[PDB]
Amino acid sequence: MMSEIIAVANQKGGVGKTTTAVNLAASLAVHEKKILLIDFAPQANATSSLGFRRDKIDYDIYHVLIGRKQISQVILKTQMPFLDLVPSNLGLAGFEKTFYDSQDENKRGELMLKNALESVVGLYDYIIIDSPPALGPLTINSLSAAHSVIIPIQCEFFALEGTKLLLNTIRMLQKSTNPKLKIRGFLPTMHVPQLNLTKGVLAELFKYFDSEFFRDSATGEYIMIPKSVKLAESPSFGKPILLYDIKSNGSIAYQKLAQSILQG
Amino acid sequence: MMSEIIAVANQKGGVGKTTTAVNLAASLAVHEKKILLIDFAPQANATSSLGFRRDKIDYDIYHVLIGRKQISQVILKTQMPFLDLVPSNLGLAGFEKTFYDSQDENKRGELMLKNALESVVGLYDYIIIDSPPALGPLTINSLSAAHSVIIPIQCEFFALEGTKLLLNTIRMLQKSTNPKLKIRGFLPTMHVPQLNLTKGVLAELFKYFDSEFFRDSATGEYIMIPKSVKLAESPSFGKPILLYDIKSNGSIAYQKLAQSILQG
Amino acid sequence: MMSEIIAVANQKGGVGKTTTAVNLAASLAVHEKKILLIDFAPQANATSSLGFRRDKIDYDIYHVLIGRKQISQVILKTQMPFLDLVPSNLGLAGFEKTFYDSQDENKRGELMLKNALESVVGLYDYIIIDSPPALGPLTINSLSAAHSVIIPIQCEFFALEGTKLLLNTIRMLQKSTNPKLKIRGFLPTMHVPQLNLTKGVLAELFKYFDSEFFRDSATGEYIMIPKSVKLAESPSFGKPILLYDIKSNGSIAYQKLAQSILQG
Amino acid sequence: MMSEIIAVANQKGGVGKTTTAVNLAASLAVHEKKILLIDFAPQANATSSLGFRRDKIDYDIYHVLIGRKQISQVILKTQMPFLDLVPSNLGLAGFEKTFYDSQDENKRGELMLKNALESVVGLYDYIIIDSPPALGPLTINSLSAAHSVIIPIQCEFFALEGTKLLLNTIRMLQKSTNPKLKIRGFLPTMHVPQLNLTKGVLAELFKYFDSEFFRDSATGEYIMIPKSVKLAESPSFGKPILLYDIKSNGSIAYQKLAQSILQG
DNA sequence: TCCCTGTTTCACGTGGAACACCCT
DNA sequence: AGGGTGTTCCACGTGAAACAGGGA
Ligand SMILES: Nc1ncnc2c1ncn2[C@@H]1O[C@H](COP(=O)(O)OP(=O)(O)OP(=O)(O)O)[C@@H](O)[C@H]1O
Ligand SMILES: Nc1ncnc2c1ncn2[C@@H]1O[C@H](COP(=O)(O)OP(=O)(O)OP(=O)(O)O)[C@@H](O)[C@H]1O
Ligand SMILES: Nc1ncnc2c1ncn2[C@@H]1O[C@H](COP(=O)(O)OP(=O)(O)OP(=O)(O)O)[C@@H](O)[C@H]1O
Ligand SMILES: Nc1ncnc2c1ncn2[C@@H]1O[C@H](COP(=O)(O)OP(=O)(O)OP(=O)(O)O)[C@@H](O)[C@H]1O
Ligand SMILES: [Mg+2]
Ligand SMILES: [Mg+2]
Ligand SMILES: [Mg+2]
Ligand SMILES: [Mg+2]
């Protein structure tokens, strides 16, 4: 049995990668698939959105990579039966020392997350990883551990040069440490369809990348997460948008996204 | 003559650090004060916002920190006569390794920017530093070099946790590397007043922090940068907002911010 | 022992004359003051609102106006010991002929209600008159027999022309038939404050009339009867709203109205 | 051509008779049929809804019945080309004496409006007559003039007793003065489908009257005018709803009403 | 059987942003 | 095209009313 490993990644800050990672893991779990969410960010917002406050987590993801803990020891069960979580902390910031000290000897350490994952790749249908807003060692680990990658795009000017940067980082990993990697899709998020900027940013991206954007395969239309404040309120209750408000615009787009993952 | 050096910092991604750093440095410079803007981010969104392209620039700030260049060589003149820019590149992400090699040697290297800025500080009234989304080495450098620090707040749930721990980084360095360091002010960003998440997030923030919020000395009112899509448009035109739409509310709010900073 | 006779009048249909007349008379009678309620409408909705079937009572007010009955025989004891009712039939539309044969004859016909009320005026603290939607004879009698007049205002467009029109009827009789007659107050009815029609109608009304709007003497605030569907439900059960839902906002507002009338 | 003459009638005040009569006459005129709106009420709200002022109306509907003018003199043209209006004044209140002065001799005068309509029944497809809130001479005249009768029903407790009375008045006239009179339909107005009262009132009415309610001939569903404050704002601009807001719910139901009339 | 308190559900005002004139 | 205007569209807060347990 094999888990599909998905990275949610962008180096631009505040683009919905944590909201995607939490609400994609949720929307997949309600289809009765076995889901593991890795909060791979030092800010650890994905953990906080599931209602586990940072201070009361005993041992975390940082302890796994060093070899201090097994990954199954740190796995927590969430509110949903088919959702499980590997949390994060401020302690994850110290991974960057551990990475670069390992680089100057064996040049591995991009793979520290893959080898951590190895034990649990057969208990899950899906393992979703939430990355920080940078192209450093945390993100690089996640891209190296992943079968595929979901890219949230806030359609605003810096996405343009930013996306081509992220894909270029993706190309050089395919050709080195992770050939098995694929672009799972591009996910327009915080989407406000009528803005001129949103139109104009989409048009430049569709120009190069259109085949790569998520289709609802049923109706052919694009899957885009609308700007909805209930998506934003939802982590204050420690719940994904499913449990919080299931009929809202955002939850709908997150369910539709789950189906397009499941069709292939 | 000593520059006041103001780092614009928040570790949460996408809260308007770059938009604020670009616009304040512009709004300060129309008063005929000499301003240097430092793009301290590998994403290099500040350099993009002033109409440069990072593929086409010769030497960046990474070449200054490694000592290869003196900082007055990499300085570019912008479209404004009082605004100069130390640009940045993806190559600034290479500073990551170098920090933990300088931590390994001197137990310093947080002061690299501080020692780089020493040649140009009698040359400008204000130096504005745009920090990346982390508590990692670059932001610590931006903070350890600075007299004061602006904290842009997008008024949403992750800010409650996130501001708190940024302050503790500030209190750490206020006891350690940079005891002179001041909090310049709290700057509400992307502000939509009528929203119950925005109200409640600002409510929780006001009981702890109210004295640290930027105010308009004429009216006594809070200075808050409104959500205006024009603020997002101007970097596509390679411009600060005052050269784009000077009458727009975002331009008005950044110039109010500028005036309250110039007062001391 | 002299009754204050309050005509509840507006020529506009459906503005809450009957609801106001029925509910004020109940709210005055729980203060243990004796109230006579006069259904001066052929539609006879007031009689229906107290739970008396139109076809099941012997003689009505029409029979007093034509002299066939002394009014004290036509009086009925309601479910409240302090509320009595002069009921009405469809027969009261038969006053219409009889009026235009009275000024023909004696130049009276204005005063028949005034003279019918002569036997019972020393017998009640308050007498409440519920008038039909016209400036014709029945409203005229109702207005000419009254010490004071309540004007219910549905705050909507026709009220502007409608209220101004009624006042000229009022000041005509103040100049002629009944000079002692005073406006008791304006009573906003079916009130929904948030509506811009309601704000605009009330505003145009306030510049001419504000002094004559009913106020709560304790808080200084206006007395307005809200839209509450409990008020509309109450006559189906044959009750005033204090016998239906005494806790509802519409009940509170009529009791405030009652309190304001009792005090002066 | 013989005009179909339609009375909008009910003796309950403020149930939407004028709003029905103006907006039905309007919704018929956009179908390129020739429409004459007789404002037959003393309060004259139909006229005021079309942006005509009482102070500037020269000779009115009162003058036609007294023989002071022929009807084609007093007819005015509205904003719409296919909508003509016969206006009213405060002077129409003096019709009531003329009726019972003709009753004292020859027992006619119920037919005074019909006889006045003789010259214009061939110049119009539709003549919409708006009656006052009573069963006296003005309503009777127009009920005797009309081919059919539309009953607006505000679904609230007094509709029950009021309707039985208005149907019974129709039976008296079907027997005597106007045998050709049909009930054109029942039109629920100010409709709020959620309320317990509204349900409860309709259920007692459907019990006796169901086939008499207006159906959409297309869908089969009932046609009811919804409570919309745009319907209320609309006369303040001197416009029927279809010029004011043609999109709004109120205008839609009034259009569907016009369609059902147009199929006979 | 009388009560209480959450959730749904629906009309209506609010303000941002696009856009179509319209100025001249 | 530059600078008004107002008009149209869309999210989101607001509060009334029904309803569903949950109260023993
Ligand atoms: N469609 C949406 N509508 C409204 N708010 C959203 C939406 N998606 C995400 N958010 C909110 O926007 C903010 C940024 O989203 P999020 O934090 O998931 O982005 P991020 O890329 O994870 O940020 P970081 O760069 O710190 O990792 C959060 O406050 C979140 O609550
Ligand atoms: N009213 C506003 N104020 C600030 N930024 C805005 C506003 N409206 C839109 N934006 C846009 O919001 C986006 C995020 O802002 P910005 O990139 O300045 O945040 P940041 O803190 O620099 O993010 P990063 O962590 O990626 O550096 C940008 O695309 C900017 O163009
Ligand atoms: N404050 C209120 N809120 C809700 N419904 C009300 C209110 N006041 C009255 N009603 C209802 O509104 C309708 C009109 O009220 P009412 O019959 O008292 O007006 P009116 O002035 O007596 O009209 P008319 O005498 O011309 O028929 C009735 O159905 C009544 O049940
Ligand atoms: N949804 C609606 N449908 C009909 N009328 C409405 C609606 N909303 C508000 N109104 C208003 O209802 C009020 C009474 O309606 P209207 O005046 O047409 O009834 P009416 O029977 O003509 O009254 P009158 O008894 O004075 O003749 C008016 O102020 C009208 O503007
Ligand atoms: Mg995140
Ligand atoms: Mg930035
Ligand atoms: Mg009445
Ligand atoms: Mg009317």
User: Å from D28 to nearest chain C CA?
Assistant: 24
Size of interface C-D (CB pairs under 8 A): 101
Considering only CA atoms, which residue is closest to atom 13 of ligand 1?
A14
Verify if strand F has an atom below 7 Å from the CB of C227: yes
Instruction: Judge whether C114 and C143 are in contact, CB under 8 Å.
Output: no
Strand intervals (E) in C93-173: 126-130, 148-154
Q: A101: which residues sit within 8 A by CB, 6+ positions away?
A: B100
Which nucleotide's C1' is closest to A193 (Cα)? F10
Instruction: Please state, in angstroms and rounded to a whole number, the distance separating the CA atoms of residues D102 and D91.
Output: 18
Instruction: Judge whether B38 and B130 are in contact, CB under 8 Å.
Output: yes
Q: D129: which residues sit within 8 A by CB, 6+ positions away?
A: D5, D6, D7, D8, D21, D38, D40, D113, D142, D145, D146
Strand partners, B151: B186
Structural domains of chain B, count: 1
Verify if strand F has an atom below 7 Å from the CB of B219: no
Q: DSSP state, C146?
A: -
Q: What angle do CA D225, D230, D235 make, to 5 degrees?
A: 100
Residue C234 CB neighbour total at 10 angstroms: 26
Q: Which domain holds residue C10?
A: 4-263
Task: Give the containing element (helix H, strand E) for C173.
Answer: helix C158-175
Residue B183 backbone phi and psi in degrees, to 5: -90, 115
Strand partners, D130: D8, D39
Q: What is the resolution of this structure in A?
A: 2.7
Residue with tokens 């289709």: A215
After which residue numbers is chain C interrupted with C–N beyond 2.5 angstroms?
Answer: none
Sequence letter at residue A254: Y
Instruction: Please state, in angstroms and rounded to a whole number, the distance separating the CA atoms of residues A62 and A19.
Output: 22
User: Å from C195 to nearest chain D CA?
Assistant: 8
Task: Give the containing element (helix H, strand E) for B167.
Answer: helix B158-175
Please give the radius of gyration of chain D, using alpha carbons only, rounded to the nearest integer. Answer: 17
Residue B207 backbone phi and psi in degrees, to 5: -70, -35
D166 CA → F3 C1’, Å: 61
C13: which chain D residues are within 8 Å (Cβ-Cβ)? 12-15, 133
Instruction: Please state, in angstroms and rounded to a whole number, the distance separating the CA atoms of residues A241 and A22.
Output: 9
Size of interface A-B (CB pairs under 8 A): 102
Strand E and chain D: which residues 177-216 have CB closer than 7 Å?
194
Q: B132: which residues sit within 8 A by CB, 6+ positions away?
A: A133, A134, B40, B41, B42, B43, B138, B139
Sequence letter at residue B26: A
Verify if strand E has an atom below 7 Å from the CB of A194: yes
Q: Could you tell me which of D189, D169, D155, D198 has the C-alpha nearest to residue C42? A: D169
The pair of structure tokens assigned to A137 is: 């060692």
Instruction: Please state, in angstroms and rounded to a whole number, the distance separating the CA atoms of residues C74 and C61.
Output: 7
Q: DSSP state, A203?
A: H
The pair of structure tokens assigned to B162 is: 């996130």
Q: Do A133 and B134 touch (CB under 8 A)?
A: yes
Q: Which residues of A95-114 are buried (b: 16+ CB within 10 A; e: fewer)?
A: bbebbbeeeeeeeebbebbb
Which of C13, C97, C136 is opposite residue D13, by nearest beta carbon?
C13
Instruction: Judge whether B129 and B38 are in contact, CB under 8 Å.
Output: yes
Parallel/antiparallel/unpaired status of strands D126-130 and D148-154: unpaired
User: Å from D148 to nearest chain C CA?
Assistant: 23
* Sequential DSSP letters for A20-82: HHHHHHHHHHTTT--EEEEE--SS-HHHHHTT--GGG--S-HHHHHHTSS-HHHH-EE-SSTT
Residues of D with CB under 8 A from a CB of C: 11-15, 42-43, 45, 48, 54, 90, 93, 96-97, 100-101, 103, 132-137, 154, 156-158, 161-162, 165, 195-197, 200, 229, 232-233, 235-236
The pair of structure tokens assigned to D188 is: 């629920």
B100: which chain A residues are within 8 Å (Cβ-Cβ)? 96-97, 100-101
Instruction: Judge whether A130 and A39 are in contact, CB under 8 Å.
Output: yes
Instruction: Please state, in angstroms and rounded to a whole number, the distance separating the CA atoms of residues D130 and D6.
Output: 9
Instruction: Please state, in angstroms and rounded to a whole number, the distance separating the CA atoms of residues A231 and A27.
Output: 13
Q: What angle do CA A97, A50, A58 make, to 5 degrees?
A: 50
Instruction: Judge whether B128 and B257 are in contact, CB under 8 Å.
Output: no
B157: which chain A residues are within 8 Å (Cβ-Cβ)? 232-233, 235-236
Chain C residue at shortest CA distance from D159: C45
Chain B residue at shortest CA distance from A13: B13
Strand partners, D35: D83, D126
Strand partners, A182: A148
Which nucleotide's C1' is closest to A227 (Cα)? F11
A132: which chain B residues are within 8 Å (Cβ-Cβ)? 13, 133-134
Instruction: Judge whether D168 and D127 are in contact, CB under 8 Å.
Output: no
Verify if strand F has an atom below 7 Å from the CB of D194: yes
Strand partners, A186: A151, A213
Instruction: Please state, in angstroms and rounded to a whole number, the distance separating the CA atoms of residues A222 and A198.
Output: 14
Instruction: Judge whether C43 and C199 are in contact, CB under 8 Å.
Output: no
**Domain of A80: which CATH number?**
3.40.50.300
Verify if strand F has an atom below 7 Å from the CB of C230: yes
Do chains C and B have 3 or more beta-carbon pairs under 8 angstroms? no
Which of D54, D93, D100 is opposite residue C97, by nearest beta carbon?
D100
Q: DSSP state, D230?
A: H
Which nucleotide's C1' is closest to D247 (Cα)? F8
Instruction: Please state, in angstroms and rounded to a whole number, the distance separating the CA atoms of residues B101 and B95.
Output: 10
Q: What angle do CA B229, B231, B235 make, to 5 degrees?
A: 115
**CB A236 less than 6 A from any atom of ligand 1:** no
Largest CA distance in chain D: 53
Which of B14, B54, B229 is opposite residue A14, by nearest beta carbon?
B14
Instruction: Please state, in angstroms and rounded to a whole number, the distance separating the CA atoms of residues D5 and D147.
Output: 5
Q: C236: which residues sit within 8 A by CB, 6+ positions away?
A: D157, D197, D200
Instruction: Please state, in angstroms and rounded to a whole number, the distance separating the CA atoms of residues D75 and D87.
Output: 8
Instruction: Please state, in angstroms and rounded to a whole number, the distance separating the CA atoms of residues C40 and C53.
Output: 16
D194 CA → E9 C1’, Å: 10
Please give the radius of gyration of chain B, using alpha carbons only, rounded to the nearest integer. Answer: 17
3-class state of residue D4 by DSSP:
strand
Instruction: Please state, in angstroms and rounded to a whole number, the distance separating the CA atoms of residues B21 and B187.
Output: 12
Sequence letter at residue C178: N
Q: Which nucleotides of F are covered by protein (CB under 7 A)?
A: 9-19
